[PDB]
């Protein structure tokens, strides 16, 4: 006879309590919002003995391995709802054919650039080596990023062709791994030409390309929505915008879905997907949480649409419509270990890349 709903401290919460008054109003339903510590860990614990919230947010990869121990109602919104969300959106949320899922924001990496050092933000990976000398001449280097991390490099390897998983109907062939084709192959091939040549060092990590950047002392840098309000403290005048191709190929960016989930265990379910539908997946509801925290890149088209007229928004749209979805299933923990390593030991000269990525390989479809 109530709605219990889960969702990070770190979101708008309070905006998210403003739509639920809005529908305790027209209801008499009551809504309550919590952000617990850890809700992601808690979640499966309290689900698997029928307890917890009526509705879980969290990032959609996370909603995988929910949905194995059947904690996650499916749902069915109807074709015209579905219509009103960009449809790469609804394969984020789909867990081997069923829906798990109503999709709310979308998150991937984006070229951050300095216009004070850099007029037009380069379109090509290709044409950063003869930049970074330019730069270099007046004690500047083009470009830093995190090494460190297959989730930062992941554009670069994948854009000519390399994938985690072949995806196809809903779901994932786990047989089907693309870190060992020619396309991975060219593309870490061309960070490691980067690192020998010394556009770049192979320690560079998160905090390093960040004060870098912040610094005024690089040009450019890669990140996502959440390194914003750093760069706006450092006074820099960035812009963001679509990442470089490579091969004519865009950079792939993995995207990562903030999502909405019914606790198969409810007895709530048609209240949870009345409020979800009618409530929060409009202007007005995207509107009101928004204006708590920022959610970036929206799924609903239409409030998409006026956010978009920030050109850092547009840009984080962009690049999430030519990157990756991440795949939500188990096996994708194999892939972030197996990947880490190849590139560490690629860029250290530990391994080859033709070796790195073979081994890489081997251990995800093993
Ligand atoms: C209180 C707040 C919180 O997050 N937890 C969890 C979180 C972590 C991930 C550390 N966890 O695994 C257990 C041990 C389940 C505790 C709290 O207990
Ligand atoms: C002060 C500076 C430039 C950054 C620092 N750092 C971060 O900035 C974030 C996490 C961290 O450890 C670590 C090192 C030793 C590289 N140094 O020297």
């Given at each position: 006879?109530?709605?219990?709903?889960?969702?990070?401290?770190?979101?708008?919460?309070?905006?998210?309590?403003?739509?639920?008054?809005?529908?305790?109003?027209?209801?008499?339903?009551?809504?309550?919002?919590?952000?617990?510590?850890?809700?992601?860990?808690?979640?499966?614990?309290?689900?698997?003995?029928?307890?917890?919230?009526?509705?879980?947010?969290?990032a959609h990869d996370?909603?995988?391995?929910?949905?194995?121990?059947?904690?996650?109602?499916?749902?069915?919104?109807?074709?015209?709802?579905?219509?009103?969300?960009?449809?790469?959106?609804?394969?984020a949320?789909?867990?081997?054919?069923?829906?798990?899922?109503?999709?709310?924001?979308?998150?991937?990496?984006?070229?951050?650039?300095?216009?004070?050092?850099?007029?037009?933000?380069?379109?090509?990976?290709?044409?950063?080596?003869?930049?970074?000398?330019?730069?270099?001449?007046?004690?500047?280097?083009?470009?830093?990023?995190?090494?460190?991390?297959?989730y930062?490099?992941?554009?670069?390897?994948?854009?000519?062709?390399?994938?985690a998983?072949?995806?196809?109907?809903?779901?994932?062939?786990?047989?089907?791994?693309?870190?060992?084709?020619?396309?991975?192959?060219?593309?870490?091939?061309?960070?490691?030409?980067?690192?020998?040549?010394?556009?770049?060092?192979?320690?560079?990590?998160?905090?390093?390309?960040?004060?870098?950047?912040?610094?005024?002392?690089?040009?450019?840098?890669?990140?996502?929505?959440?390194?914003?309000?750093?760069?706006?403290?450092?006074?820099?005048?960035?812009?963001?915008?679509?990442?470089?191709?490579?091969?004519?190929?865009?950079?792939?960016?993995f995207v990562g879905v903030?999502?909405?989930?019914?606790?198969?265990?409810?007895?709530?379910?048609?209240?949870?997907?009345?409020?979800?539908?009618?409530?929060?997946?409009?202007?007005?509801?995207?509107?009101?949480?928004?204006?708590?925290?920022?959610?970036?890149?929206?799924?609903?088209?239409?409030?998409?649409?006026?956010?978009?007229?920030?050109?850092?928004?547009?840009?984080?749209?962009?690049?999430?419509?030519?990157?990756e979805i991440m795949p939500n299933?188990?096996?994708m923990?194999?892939?972030?270990?197996?990947?880490?390593?190849?590139?560490?030991?690629?860029?250290?000269?530990?391994?080859?890349?033709?070796?790195?990525?073979?081994?890489?390989?081997?251990?995800?479809?093993?």
């Amino acid at each position: 006879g109530k709605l219990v709903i889960w969702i990070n401290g770190d979101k708008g919460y309070n905006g998210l309590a403003e739509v639920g008054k809005k529908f305790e109003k027209d209801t008499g339903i009551k809504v309550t919002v919590e952000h617990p510590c850890k809700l992601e860990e808690k979640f499966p614990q309290v689900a698997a003995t029928g307890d917890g919230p009526d509705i879980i947010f969290w990032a959609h990869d996370r909603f995988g391995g929910y949905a194995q121990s059947g904690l996650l109602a499916e749902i069915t919104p109807d074709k015209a709802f579905q219509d009103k969300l960009y449809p790469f959106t609804w394969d984020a949320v789909r867990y081997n054919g069923k829906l798990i899922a109503y999709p709310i924001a979308v998150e991937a990496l984006s070229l951050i650039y300095n216009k004070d050092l850099l007029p037009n933000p380069p379109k090509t990976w290709e044409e950063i080596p003869a930049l970074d000398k330019e730069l270099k001449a007046k004690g500047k280097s083009a470009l830093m990023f995190n090494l460190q991390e297959p989730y930062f490099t992941w554009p670069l390897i994948a854009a000519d062709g390399g994938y985690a998983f072949k995806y196809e109907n809903g779901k994932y062939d786990i047989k089907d791994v693309g870190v060992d084709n020619a396309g991975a192959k060219a593309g870490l091939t061309f960070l490691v030409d980067l690192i020998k040549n010394k556009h770049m060092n192979a320690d560079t990590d998160y905090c390093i390309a960040e004060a870098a950047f912040n610094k005024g002392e690089t040009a450019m840098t890669i990140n996502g929505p959440w390194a914003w309000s750093n760069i706006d403290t450092s006074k820099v005048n960035y812009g963001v915008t679509v990442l470089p191709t490579f091969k004519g190929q865009p950079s792939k960016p993995f995207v990562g879905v903030l999502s909405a989930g019914i606790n198969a265990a409810s007895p709530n379910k048609e209240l949870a997907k009345e409020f979800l539908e009618n409530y929060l997946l409009t202007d007005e509801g995207l509107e009101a949480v928004n204006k708590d925290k920022p959610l970036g890149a929206v799924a609903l088209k239409s409030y998409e649409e006026e956010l978009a007229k920030d050109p850092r928004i547009a840009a984080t749209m962009e690049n999430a419509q030519k990157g990756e979805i991440m795949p939500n299933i188990p096996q994708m923990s194999a892939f972030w270990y197996a990947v880490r390593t190849a590139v560490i030991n690629a860029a250290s000269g530990r391994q080859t890349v033709d070796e790195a990525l073979k081994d890489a390989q081997t251990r995800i479809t093993k």
